[PDB]
Amino acid sequence: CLAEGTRIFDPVTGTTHRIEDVVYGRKPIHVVAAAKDGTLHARPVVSWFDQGTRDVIGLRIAGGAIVWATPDHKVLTEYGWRAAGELRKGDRVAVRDVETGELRYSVIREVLPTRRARTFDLEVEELHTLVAEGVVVHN
């Protein structure tokens, strides 16, 4: 689950949305998703979910981004799918290079304390993952 305020870049329209708005209006946007062979493609959001308030932690990535998600959220790392919760400073997560648009790895700056906040999800045709706050994560 992802907290409200999570930025989801629409690779097709270049537009950046706040996840909750995508959900609230069941908006048919696209997101950047990475194939198992580690890549990145444009994919439509076929499902929307208002998961409700839960506890989210926050991983501040090198570059500036900060992901707020439920400790169980799978994040792509220098290992492959892992749980946000079981991640620490120094660990590298998969991200979308804003320039090239390629998958690379950024170090976590610091892991922020848990908090309450609305949460959401989005399923994505095929690939099954999305790029949120510049970080590749499990859809």
Applying CB under 5 A, the residues found at the interface with Zn ion are 123, 128, 139
- 109, two tokens: 């700056």
Among 14, 16, 26, 36, binds a copy of itself (CB under 8 A): 36
- By C-beta, is 10 or 123 nearer to Zn ion? 123
Residue given tokens 């992901």 in the structure block: 67
Among 13, 42, 72, 101, binds a copy of itself (CB under 8 A): 72
From the list a copy of itself, Zn ion, none, which binds 92 (C-beta under 5 to 8 Å, kind-based)?
Answer: none
Residue 72 CA from chain centroid, whole number: 13
Among 4, 20, 91, 121, binds a copy of itself (CB under 8 A): 121
Which segment (15-23, 79-87, 93-101, 110-118) binds a copy of itself by CB under 8 A?
Answer: 79-87
Looking at the DSSP bridge assignments, the partners of residue 30 are 44
From the list Zn ion, a copy of itself, none, which binds 24 (C-beta under 5 to 8 Å, kind-based)?
Answer: none
Provide DSSP, 123-138: EETTT-EEEETTEEEE
Residue 80: partners with Cβ closer than 8 Å, 6 or more residues away: none
Task: Count the neighbouring beta carbons within 10 Å of the beta carbon of residue 26.
Answer: 9
Question: If binding is defined by CB under 8 A, does position 123 make contact with a copy of itself?
Answer: yes
